[PDB]
Write a protein that binds this ligand. Structure first.
Ligand code: ZN
Ligand code: ZN
Ligand code: ZN
Ligand code: ZN
Ligand code: ZN
Ligand code: ZN
Ligand code: ZN
Lengths: 633, 311, 87, 73
């Protein structure tokens, strides 16, 4: 990234990291490794490594104890170390402290009183020791498993006598040095275990976190702010600064697992992070060196460092506006009228701008010329136009095709002239006269002239598809594609499919059915053939109602005779296998042949009039046949 | 129609229509999706549902085809894609109306773009994110909506991006029902068209040139009868680019790319482009609160038709 | 399955409507079938989206779609079928 | 709701309203109108039609003055 400054690699595994609280030197303590990892801005490397010789986090001392490092090794005692006592002759051990009967989960040096330390763990007891001298003061936590205990920070800028505890019982317990065995403030932090505890650097605000994934801010001087991270949060480290307002606090939310990243949240914007600092491997711990630099360790054992004053902001990269269209003219066109805020003091609710572009444009036009409703026009031209057409024999068929295409062109010109748009009446008059020219040369029987039928029809098609007249180009594609090869079959079929999808986008379905019923291209919408076919099994014998014998007999009788009305006797209301006579209506018990109305949960037929009368006029809710249920409405 | 005020507590990122234009789904960074409905009475927008979908900023949304039900799909910065099917029995503005179907938590990076395929491909879904690979999720049996299988895992980049926070990905499908399957990938600064050959696998078909900065949007155009196809790309640099794609019938068709027009009229950063249903008028929204409409002139060159200001 | 009917063996939806190409047997469609005293109007609107089919050509429609189609035409809306389902 | 400002830029309807001509012809549309009209005027003068050549030359000269001495003294 841009703000990345320091990086290296470690040959062995790491567990935690802490900062040497010293403005003179620029080292770090990484946790059984305990290395004084010193970084230098001249080379941007942490190659200066002083090789000084579990569920724990390493911590360094403050104030007069400016050189003490505590780490847990055997999970039963706290081991103190000194950086000055790192020589070969000098013993690199300080007097250890051991009273915990179970595993130690946390410990922390105090920032105001250097001779006082705190810890905790699964032993359900918070103890206080002394470094100048078994603990001195022990506080029972009522069988609550301590995960984190942190001191109240001093943080001398332009106190330290209290501490809090997070627990597996989801309770935040504020304590006091001068008030042992009695918690000062008790708060129910989270449902389930709470795994995070830290204090705000300036104000008395405590931000926690646990298995609920809700980083909740608590006032200790139902929560103040709630950040629904969703993942189990494991670590929080506030930035070192003077935050006069509590909303201008940069907080490092991090988790442990296969998806771990350094996320630096500002409390002013609890929904967008400010830095999503990410490494090649999942991270484990993050610490703040100063007001700018923050380091981390990872599963890949790389001591990466970032500069938050030279990092891109996540808010700037996020999408700010969007547009979509609803139809051809632009009856519905959207935006978002949202303002970008800051990470310091949240946002007014954004306004989605739905605009009637044709109405606004007509208003501005009529205003400009003083010194309608083209969706209805599209409906009118979809409904009222004639899209459908339906060796001497071929000549006669071609002549008849030209004649009734002339008739269709005349009808289209007339219905354009009915609504008074001359710009397409002229087009269809041109097409009609070109067809008349072709008809007169069929009856009478270097580049082509511009009044040639194929060339002129193709040029009018190209002008229509460049201008945006969907209806006219689609009409030309139905009427003059097979006889005049205008474009490829793929382009024509795609245009017809897009026109039918456009008709489906409006509530114009009968028009789309009219268009698809007489389409010369047989595979426009769907490739399964009969997608509306409903084959039935017999209610008496159980075999499928195919009635092939009846169809064969009626086809033979209609072939031997000269009428097509014999084939109207074919139907699926009777069975040929079991000789079922007819299907009866559920209300009137009359024969039912041509249109039914199926009741869904019980499977009963019925006329439109019978079912409609029973369910609207009589206002009944059950099936007429009698069924254990309600087939309402 | 009139503008309406959402209940969103932060920025709205992606807004997508349904098929019929009667429903608007707005996904935002406050971990929320708000689906609105267009009432025939009084001609104003009323809220229908508003529920929490993800644990981070939802950056993309898309409706499915109307024949497969009321399905939206949300991609966010939680490295997940979650689908939502509407249950009409529940009351409106209750939060239990839209029920989760499946969570496609397979990306190692945060997902930026989700797009449904055209309805003639089946219920097919696409994903692009910070990992740098294009993922295709198909329901081979559309009987059950909870059975999604990853059918294509194509690497659109030579290397994954090291700078993960400075990236933006977009996808756009080709709505041509009878042309071969085409998909547009705008990964970081390129734009690659992907076709399906006889092998059943995606292949690189053509590359849109230019694009000096990050690509914030891409939009294929619905060509109703045209002999060419249009792709509109919006960039971080602020330049609208319209590419004239021509197709002539291992891939079954070769593509030639000609930059038809270039427009830097947004003095800033372009965040979205979207054609209309004719493929003639193109919208373009910038970071200045301005929306411009582009229509092709008599020559093969688009020009700005209007500017929409939101004072 | 009080709002959506499917095959119990495989889960596939019903055969599609011949007018709007939506799968039949599903209530609460995205549109309103305003086919050819507010309670009776609402009952008619929710009655228009039912399962109606002809017993001579076996082609399915919504009730409102079949009522609106056969108020202007007299042939089955499926391509390739010549069956006067009205009378 | 905010206030939305709409600014039409090069609207075709306004430009059609601002045009008194049926067509906006140019010299690029008809490159050789002068020579063809002049030669047909010469051919018309060779016939017994001396007014038609004056009509056609008046049309040509009107268009030439639109996009831009034997009878003087
Ligand atoms: Zn039978
Ligand atoms: Zn009856
Ligand atoms: Zn019944
Ligand atoms: Zn089945
Ligand atoms: Zn229907
Ligand atoms: Zn039929
Ligand atoms: Zn029938």
């Amino acid at each position: 990234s841009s703000g990345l400054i320091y990086t290296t690699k470690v040959d062995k595994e790491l567990s935690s990291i802490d900062k040497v609280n010293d403005p003179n030197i620029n080292g770090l303590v990484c946790a059984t490794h305990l290395g004084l990892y010193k970084f230098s801005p001249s080379d941007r490397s942490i190659k200066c490594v002083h090789d000084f010789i579990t569920i724990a986090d390493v911590k360094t001392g403050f104030n007069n104890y400016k050189n003490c490092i505590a780490v847990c090794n055997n999970s039963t005692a706290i081991s103190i170390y000194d950086l000055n006592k790192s020589s070969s002759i000098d013993n690199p051990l300080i007097t250890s402290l051991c009273e915990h009967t179970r595993s130690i989960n946390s410990f922390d040096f105090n920032m105001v009183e250097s001779n006082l330390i705190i810890s905790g763990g699964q032993d359900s007891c918070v103890k206080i020791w002394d470094l100048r001298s078994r603990s001195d003061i022990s506080i029972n936590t009522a069988s609550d498993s301590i995960r984190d205990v942190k001191w109240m920070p001093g943080y001398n800028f332009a106190s330290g006598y209290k501490f809090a505890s997070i627990h597996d019982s989801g309770y935040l317990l504020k304590f006091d040095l001068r008030q042992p065995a009695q918690y000062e403030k008790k708060l129910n932090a989270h449902t389930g275990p709470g795994l995070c505890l830290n204090w705000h650097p300036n104000q008395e605000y405590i931000a926690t976190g646990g298995r609920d994934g809700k980083c909740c801010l608590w006032f200790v001087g139902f929560p103040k702010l709630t950040i629904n991270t969703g993942y189990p949060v494991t670590k929080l480290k506030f930035k070192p600064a003077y935050s006069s307002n509590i909303y201008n606090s940069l907080l490092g939310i991090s988790s442990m697992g296969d998806e771990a990243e350094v996320r630096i949240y500002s409390l002013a914007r609890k929904y967008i992070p400010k830095h999503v600092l990410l490494s090649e491997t999942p991270s484990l711990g993050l610490v703040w060196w100063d007001e700018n630099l923050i380091f981390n360790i990872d599963k890949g054992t790389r001591i990466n460092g970032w500069d938050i004053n030279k990092e891109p902001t996540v808010l700037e990269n996020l999408s700010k506006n969007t547009t979509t269209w609803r139809d051809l003219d632009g009856n519905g066109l959207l935006s978002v009228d949202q303002e970008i805020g800051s990470y310091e003091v949240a946002i007014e609710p954004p306004c989605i701008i739905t605009l009637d572009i044709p109405q606004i444009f007509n208003n501005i036009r009529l205003t400009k010329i003083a010194h309608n409703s083209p969706v209805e026009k599209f409906k009118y031209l979809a409904r009222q136009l004639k899209f459908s057409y339906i060796v001497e024999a071929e000549l006669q068929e071609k002549i008849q095709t030209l004649v009734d295409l002339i008739s269709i062109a005349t009808h289209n010109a007339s219905v354009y002239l009915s609504i008074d748009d001359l710009t397409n009446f002229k087009i269809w008059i041109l097409i009609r006269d070109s067809l008349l020219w072709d008809l007169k040369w069929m009856t009478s029987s270097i580049a082509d002239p511009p009044w040639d039928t194929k060339k002129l029809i193709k040029q009018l098609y190209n002008q229509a598809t460049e201008t945006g007249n969907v209806v006219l180009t689609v009409n030309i594609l139905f009427l003059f594609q097979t006889i005049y090869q205008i474009t490829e079959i793929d382009i024509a079929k795609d245009a017809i499919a897009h026109f039918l999808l456009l008709l489906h986008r409006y509530e114009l379905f009968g028009i789309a059915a009219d268009v698809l019923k007489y389409c010369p291209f047989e595979d426009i919408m769907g490739s399964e053939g009969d997608q509306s076919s409903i084959r039935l099994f017999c209610e008496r014998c159980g075999e499928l109602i195919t009635n092939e014998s009846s169809k064969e007999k009626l086809r033979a009788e209609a072939q031997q005779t000269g009428n097509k009305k014999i084939m109207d006797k074919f139907g699926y209301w009777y069975c040929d296998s079991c000789k079922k006579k007819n299907t009866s209506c559920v209300l009137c018990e009359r024969p039912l042949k041509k249109l039914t109305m199926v009741i869904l949960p019980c499977g009963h037929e019925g006329h439109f009039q019978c079912i409609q009368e029973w369910f609207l006029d009589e206002n009944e809710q059950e099936c007429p046949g009698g069924c254990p249920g309600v087939a309402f409405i | 129609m009139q503008p309406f005020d959402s209940g969103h507590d932060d920025l709205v990122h992606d807004v997508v229509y349904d098929f019929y234009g009667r429903h608007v789904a707005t996904c935002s960074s406050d971990q929320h999706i708000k689906v609105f409905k267009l009432d025939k009475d009084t001609s104003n927008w009323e809220l229908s549902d508003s529920w929490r979908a993800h644990d981070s900023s939802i950056v993309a949304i898309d409706w499915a085809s109307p024949e497969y039900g009321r399905i939206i799909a949300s991609a966010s910065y939680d490295k997940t894609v979650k689908l939502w099917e509407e249950d009409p029995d529940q009351e409106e503005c209750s939060g239990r109306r839209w029920n989760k179907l499946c969570t496609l938590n397979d990306s190692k990076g945060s997902l930026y773009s989700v797009k449904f395929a055209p309805a003639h491909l089946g219920l097919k879904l696409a994903c692009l994110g910070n990992d740098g690979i294009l993922r295709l999720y198909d329901a081979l049996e559309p009987s059950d909506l909870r059975s999604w299988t990853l059918t294509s895992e194509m690497k659109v980049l030579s290397i994954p991006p090291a700078n993960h926070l400075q990236s933006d990905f977009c996808l756009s499908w080709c709505p041509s029902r009878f042309s071969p399957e085409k998909l547009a990938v705008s990964a970081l600064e390129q734009a690659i068209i992907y076709q399906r050959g006889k092998d059943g696998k995606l292949h690189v078909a053509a590359k849109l040139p230019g694009h000096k900065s990050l690509i914030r949007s891409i939009s294929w155009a619905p060509s109703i009868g045209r002999w060419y196809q249009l792709i509109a790309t919006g960039c971080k640099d602020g330049r609208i680019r319209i590419f004239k794609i021509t197709e002539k019938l291992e891939l079954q068709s070769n593509l030639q790319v000609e930059l038809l027009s270039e427009h830097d009229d947004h003095n800033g950063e372009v965040w979205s482009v979207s054609w209309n249903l004719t493929g003639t008028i193109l919208s373009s929204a910038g970071d200045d609160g301005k929306v411009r409409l582009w229509k092709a002139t008599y020559s093969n060159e688009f020009k700005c038709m209007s500017v929409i200001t939101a004072q | 399955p009080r709002h959506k009917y499917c095959c119990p063996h495989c889960g596939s939806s019903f055969p599609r409507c011949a007018i709007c190409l939506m799968p039949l047997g599903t209530s609460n469609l995205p549109f309103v079938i305003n086919g050819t005293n507010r309670e009776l109007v609402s009952r008619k609107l929710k009655l228009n989206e039912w399962f109606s089919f002809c017993l001579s050509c076996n082609h399915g429609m919504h009730a409102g779609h079949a009522e609106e189609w056969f108020d202007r035409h007299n042939v089955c809306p499926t391509p390739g079928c010549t069956c006067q389902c009205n009378k | 709701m905010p206030d939305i400002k709409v600014e039409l830029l090069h609207d075709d309807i306004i430009e059609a309203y601002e045009q008194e001509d049926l067509l906006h012809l140019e010299v690029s549309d008809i490159p050789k109108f002068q020579t063809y009209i002049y030669q047909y005027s010469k051919l018309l003068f060779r016939w017994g039609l001396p007014l038609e050549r004056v009509k056609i030359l008046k049309v040509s000269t009107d268009f030439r003055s639109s996009y831009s001495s034997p009878y003087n003294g």
